[PDB]
Amino acid sequence: MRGQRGEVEQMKSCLRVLSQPMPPTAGEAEQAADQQEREGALELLADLCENMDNAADFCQLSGMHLLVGRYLEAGAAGLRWRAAQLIGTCSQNVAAIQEQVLGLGALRKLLRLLDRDACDTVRVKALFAISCLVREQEAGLLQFLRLDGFSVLMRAMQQQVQKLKVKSAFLLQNLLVGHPEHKGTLCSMGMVQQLVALVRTEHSPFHEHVLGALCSLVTDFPQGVRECREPELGLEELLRHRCQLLQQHEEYQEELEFCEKLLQTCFS
């Protein structure tokens, strides 16, 4: 094992707490206390797993098996979000762990969390882990696509909490830059229409990424341009009007530039 002796013992002690059964018959005070103990073990493991050596030990001790298998579907929100966070921490920019986590069925569970969870903290941490597994990882992206993850990402962007809609839009934008092979499928899914609909909501920083994503989909891509030109969409007017609104807020220059590329590309 790669970690120092003290770190390994912390890790093993934490895994022991987390590996214990939920209190078989319990009252209120003992459930809460038990939950706190587990939340605390999850945080200590995350502190440790920021370091790549420790995260690899974590995997070797079957810690990912425990997190996917039990904690992503834990009854308590505080456990689910901390489990998703830990997944993301271990896997961020370590290809071998990403592949391990993907092989354990984490993407399906994580996408369910992002799409369905009552807790907003759970949704955001699930999106973080997903971004960690899917970006630099072609097999994870292929699985994400088959699990309908782009639709889950769109619903997150349609929803009302702005940290979450900004984070999802940023991830789509990133995926479109790094994975131009998928532009055809997303256009065929009606993504141009869905994204333009977002451009018509109340203006905010969110729109920059929405419009950046639209830019990718028309660049070197005739189907994307055709969808953009559809008369019922009303895109041209929406863009000309946006350009005029942003032309004097310099803090929106990036959004303005996406708007002007789209006009130039699609409307002469």
Q: Does the domain made of 2-268 have the CATH classification 3.40.50.2000?
A: no
Sign of the Cα pseudo-torsion (171, 177, 181, 186, in order): positive
Residue with tokens 């920083």: 205
Structure-determination approach: X-ray
17 touches 37 (CB < 8 A): yes
Resolution of the determined structure in angstroms stands at 2.1
- Among 49, 152, 148, residue whose Cα is nearest residue 91: 49
Q: Cα–Cα distance between 123 and 10 in angstroms, integer?
A: 28
Task: Supply 18's token pair.
Answer: 């987390």
- Sketch the domain layout of the chain as residue ranges: 2-268
Alpha helix stretches (DSSP H) within the chain: 5-19, 28-49, 52-60, 63-66, 77-91, 95-103, 106-116, 120-134, 138-146, 149-158, 162-178, 183-188, 191-199, 206-218, 222-229, 235-246, 253-266
Q: Cα–Cα distance between 193 and 233 in angstroms, integer?
A: 7
| CA 253, chain centre distance (Å) | 26
Q: Cα–Cα distance between 56 and 8 in angstroms, integer?
A: 11
| CA 113, chain centre distance (Å) | 11
Task: Supply 53's token pair.
Answer: 């050596």
Greatest alpha-carbon span in the chain:
70
| CA 227, chain centre distance (Å) | 26
